[PDB]
Swiss-Prot record, chains A, B:
Binds 1 thiamine pyrophosphate per subunit. Pfam families: TPP_enzyme_C, TPP_enzyme_M_2, TPP_enzyme_N. Signal peptide: none annotated. One of its GO terms (molecular function) is magnesium ion binding. Its EC number is 2.2.1.9. The keyword Transferase applies. This is 2-succinyl-5-enolpyruvyl-6-hydroxy-3-cyclohexene-1-carboxylate synthase. Keywords: Magnesium, Manganese, Menaquinone biosynthesis, Metal-binding, Thiamine pyrophosphate, Transferase. InterPro entries: MenaQ_synth_MenD, MenD_middle, THDP-binding, Thiamin_PyroP_enz_TPP-bd_dom, TPP_enzyme_TPP-bd. Induction: By isopropyl-beta-D-thiogalactoside (IPTG). It comes from the Bacteria. The keyword GTP-binding does not apply.
């Protein structure tokens, strides 16, 4: 009888199904057409609910929650451009593996392509970027609940990584009293409603087999490259490489402790690349390598075999080496391919790395973004986590700092967009409840400015450092043409962030020197709130300091 | 030989080709992969260049420019999530007709699906939303320039309406001095380079034939419904309806002068629906009707025939009436189907319309958003234009005000997104150079907050009224459930906009009464800058006032 009531019962099956696959967090944006999903979610006690008004920011909030928690995170939006705004976060999830379940409300079929308000063609609108796409039919009791739950269960159960687009059409009426319409339809699932398992259990595991010739290859001269992995995996990789006697090139994203720090500098020295030419195998664990010199060495090296171990699917070597692409949990993979103690084979590179770090330390005093990057270890919150933005900051920390082994680092380095960094950081914080240091550039902060609304709600202190060098100064590091550089690349916006902080009642500091910065941090970690720290630096100093250190270390 | 030089020669052909199709404005976001396109655009004197750091805002800026100028507008962005952020504006263009030419830089094929930084699958990523999609090949001199320009000319020449996605892969190196690589390849186009015409002229016109039985139908009892159309078309439709003696129901977007104003109120009166039951034909010109009562009457009416005349393609009647869907320029269509002088047949509705407007006038004094909407016709800038936002404001003006015939009104009412209203308003202002009044809600202003950066640059005064009723109070108008309403629908953010204005050095006023509002207006119109006027109102007053007026008029 009641369409409004059946809509809600149809939606309740969808939401309850998700709880059987570890969905705990659900992020919801406002709308009318999404009513059946949103009310089902609100009524379901299994969920932690997050809200936001900008669906692009909502998608990145969900991304951050998923990134840290390692469980699927659901999103509810209404029909129309609300759905399109989820694209950036979905694309990033497709590259780095976050499980985002996008529940996108839709008009019913009879209201598509007829000029109806807020009605667009939604099935397939994210093309190949979701791992799975479900285009649900117009709700009807003539399709059994067991079909609906089974379709959800197949999508979630078989999900190795990445997003799922579930398009959910609903016809009006959407509002009205809840009657018994659809109760017997639901009850056909019997005591599944009281169960904690999926209706259909379909959970194949995707994993490469052990490499049986590892105990041959581990005897050879090898290099370990560590990219993005978990904080615990970083510690395990550091011990493993040390035991192998192989040099470990550790990315800022690796949490290995970077025992040969400043690789972006010393990989520029001919003595280093000459010694690495002796490598017969490279075993890379993790991916999304940060530094230019590392990417260039990776592209140029010619070991007999190149292996990449990661739980991400697909090719991960942009230089297309002869070798192996091994899909595995990194910690599990290390157990299956253990190290045996062996004399180290590198003799020159440890010296060069020490010399490289000494060159950076010699330049630590100037109050600039290169020095902030170098020193950032001194400002990490205890038992906290770091969220590192894109553009210069991730490159500077990677090149100039040595981050502690096992200290959690998070980032958006799949597609490396500057469009969702504040909202992602908010999700990273909420997921773990840890004190968080997030560092972003000024254009990045402007891009996601309204995410400061989300940052009014954190469970532990969050410090947002905005490095304001007046534009995208990565384009002062790149050899962009001088005539067009300011207008068409740097795009200085000539703003500060004190009023932004004030709008959202966030504490704000603009430290002028190292002492003021240390005071600002000591202030900030005291309460479970977000503090904005704006570091104003001269436009090109960071880029130029990196360039100078590169040159200096190359001549060592 | 030089890859960087040839990249730029390939791009130069693309950009110069666009000048032969009326492209004057180009909107550019920052990046490296986009270098060939951006430098080709920058060097070409034919263009006016606009920049912005948020690609979602950039798309909407281009939308606003296209909306007013009625010419194609180009957009350049770099690869990755930058491209995804264009989706909302592209979808809106697809619905309302703006010609947006999206030049999306891409990695070359050898860097896709291999874990390379900022590389994603871009061809087809907008699915069916572009009118035309071009996936350009990896640049090479082995494909002649005549092919490249012909492909562009086909897409632009045959473009009736909506967006074009042109995906543009470029391999590194991207930077370097320009040499003669690709010069002889370009010169194969000969004096096309000096021409004002396309290489291939392909421009078939899409248009419905003259209706041969119009002289029969124009003598019947007809109703004219006017939706979105140009300001000049609105004046012509008003005269045409008046001549025929047919009642004209005119949308806020119609610029007809709304001779039977407050239709959203008087269509709720049974006597008006009874009189309209006598209508034998409904001729609707334009689409995207605003008001609920009008959409309800449209859905219930059963004239012998229902016609919709508009220059947008496809079905435009969400009630699927028996009738005709006629594709034409509305002005041309009226000339082809002229009015005959006939006696008006409606008697009751003119009475009701006057009584309805009197009911609204009686409540004009309170300092609320309903009253602002009613009185907005008194505050329109001389020789200016109005940009109306979504949610309550467009509904309140449509229901409560009578806007002058021929006074330009602009909006985003295809998909009615609240995600790009500020950036669109900026483009609307820049394209015409006219003084502009823009009115939006608080969640809408927060959504596109960083577009205040764009509003620092307007060519005539722009008044941005932000109506702050603390949340999306359209959900206090809709029968949303009270228990979940605040957290999951209204989502109050409890902010003001004084600091937002200050951040971007915009003048700001928060008037407490009508005198202060009028003082703010008078001052704002004196300089070619943006003034932010925040009207703080009681949350539910606007929605309740509309409900009350609906009830009162229904009982007349
Ligand atoms: C959504 C989107 N659209 C455009 C871009 C292009 N893009 C970049 C990629 O080239 C770099 C990706 C990376 O880190 O690898 S970096 C950059 C400027 C950032 O300026 P900033 O925050 O002030 O930082 P600073 O440069 O240190 O001063 C841009 C605009 C993008 N990434 N994402
Ligand atoms: C991108 C996106 N995502 C979500 C929505 C859903 N949505 C709406 C559509 O349902 C109504 C469209 C219309 O027809 O006008 S209106 C609305 C609230 C806006 O709040 P406000 O600015 O403070 O204004 P007020 O309600 O008058 O107080 C939302 C959140 C959307 N439209 N677009
Ligand atoms: Mn910057
Ligand atoms: Mn509001």
């Amino acid at each position: 009888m009641s369409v409004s009531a059946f809509n809600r019962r149809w939606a309740a099956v969808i939401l309850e199904a998700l709880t059987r696959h570890g969905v705990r967090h659900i992020c919801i944006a406002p709308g009318s057409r999404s009513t059946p999903l949103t009310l089902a979610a609100a009524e379901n006690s299994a969920f932690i609910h997050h809200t936001h008004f900008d669906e692009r920011g909502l998608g990145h909030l969900a991304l951050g929650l998923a990134k840290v928690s390692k469980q699927p995170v659901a999103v509810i939006v209404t029909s129309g451009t609300a759905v399109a705004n989820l694209y950036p976060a979905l694309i990033e999830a497709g590259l780095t593996g976050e499980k985002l379940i996008l529940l996108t409300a839709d008009r019913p079929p009879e209201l598509i392509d007829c000029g109806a308000n807020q009605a667009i063609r939604q099935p397939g609108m994210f093309a190949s970027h979701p791992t799975h796409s479900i285009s649900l039919p117009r709700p009807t009791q003539d399709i059994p609940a067991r079909w609906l739950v089974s379709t959800i269960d197949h999508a979630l159960g078989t999900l190795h990584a990445g997003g799922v687009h579930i398009n959910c059409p609903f016809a009006e009426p959407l509002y009205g009293e809840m009657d018994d319409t659809g109760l017997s339809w639901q009850q056909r699932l019997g005591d599944w409603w009281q169960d904690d398992k999926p209706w259909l259990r379909e959970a194949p595991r995707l994993e490469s087999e052990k490499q049986r010739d590892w105990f041959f290859w581990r005897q050879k001269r090898g290099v370990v490259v560590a990219g993005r992995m978990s904080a615990e995996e970083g510690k395990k990789v550091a011990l493993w490489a040390q035991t192998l006697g192989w040099p470990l090139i550790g990315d800022v994203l690796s949490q290995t402790g970077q025992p040969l720090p400043c690789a972006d500098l010393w990989l520029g020295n001919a003595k280093a690349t000459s010694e690495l030419q002796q490598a017969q195998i490279v075993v890379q664990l993790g991916s999304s390598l940060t530094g230019k010199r590392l990417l260039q060495w990776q592209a140029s090296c010619e070991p007999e075999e190149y292996w990449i171990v990661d739980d991400i699917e697909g090719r991960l070597d942009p230089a297309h080496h002869r070798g192996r692409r091994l899909i595995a949990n990194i910690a599990d993979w290390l157990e299956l391919h253990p190290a045996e103690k062996r004399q180290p084979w590198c003799v020159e590179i440890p010296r060069l790395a020490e010399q490289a770090m000494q060159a950076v330390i010699a330049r630590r005093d100037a109050f600039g973004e290169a020095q902030l990057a170098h020193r950032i270890c001194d400002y990490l919150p205890e038992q906290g986590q770091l969220f590192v933005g894109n553009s210069l900051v991730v490159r500077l920390i990677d090149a100039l700092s040595q981050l502690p082994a096992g200290y959690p680092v998070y980032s958006n380095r799949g597609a490396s967009g500057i469009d969702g960094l504040l909202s992602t950081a908010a999700g990273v914080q909420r997921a773990s409840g840890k004190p968080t240091l997030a560092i972003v550039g000024d254009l990045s902060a402007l891009y996601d400015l309204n995410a400061l609304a989300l940052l009014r709600q954190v469970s532990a202190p969050l410090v947002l450092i905005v490095v304001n060098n007046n534009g995208g100064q990565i384009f002062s590091l790149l050899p962009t043409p001088q005539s067009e550089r300011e207008r068409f690349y740097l795009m200085p916006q000539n703003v500060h962030f004190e009023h932004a902080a004030a709008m959202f009642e966030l504490k704000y500091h603009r430290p002028q020197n190292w002492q003021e910065l240390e005071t600002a941090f000591a202030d900030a970690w005291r309460t479970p709130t977000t503090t904005v720290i704006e570091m104003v630096v001269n436009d090109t100093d960071g880029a130029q300091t990196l360039q100078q250190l590169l040159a200096q270390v190359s001549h060592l």
